[PDB]
Design a protein around this ligand. Structure first.
Ligand SMILES: O=[N+]([O-])c1cc(Cl)c(O)c2ncccc12
Length: 124
């Protein structure tokens, strides 16, 4: 079945809140969340429901915007770069599992371009 979801808290990890990390939540994630193509990325891939029994055979560092949102809400990250790496893992996993031009990939590519637009300029 499905693996445990990625952690959204960790008391051994030091927490921080920066202007940039608040912006990644309130502006970047909250607007990506509203996109019509966001729904596949709002929660961990349910390989059992989706009948993708090889998914977690191939994807060993899963990530999703639901997990990122909870991390941001928990101040789980030390800096904005940690959060941006999670977004990139999410996108890269989708391009690894799937193939150019697949419906799910076109959705990921639309979100990625939007994501790149929004982090082009972060607050001070
Ligand atoms: O939720 N989904 O339907 C979903 C999400 C993600 Cl992130 C994927 O890579 C998928 N790949 C193939 C089929 C469905 C997928």
């Amino acid at each position: 079945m499905n693996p445990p979801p990625p952690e959204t808290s960790n008391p051994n990890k030091p927490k921080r809140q920066t202007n940039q990390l608040q912006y990644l939540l309130r502006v970047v994630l909250k607007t990506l969340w509203k996109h019509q193509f966001a729904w596949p990325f709002q929660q961990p891939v349910d390989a059992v429901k989706l009948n993708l029994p090889d998914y977690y055979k191939i994807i060993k560092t899963p990530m999703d915007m639901g997990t990122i949102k909870k991390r941001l809400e928990n101040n789980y990250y030390w800096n904005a770069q940690e959060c941006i790496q999670d977004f990139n893992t999410m996108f890269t996993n989708c391009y690894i599992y799937n193939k150019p031009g697949d419906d799910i990939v076109l959705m990921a590519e639309a979100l990625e371009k939007l994501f790149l637009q929004k982090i082009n300029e972060l607050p001070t």
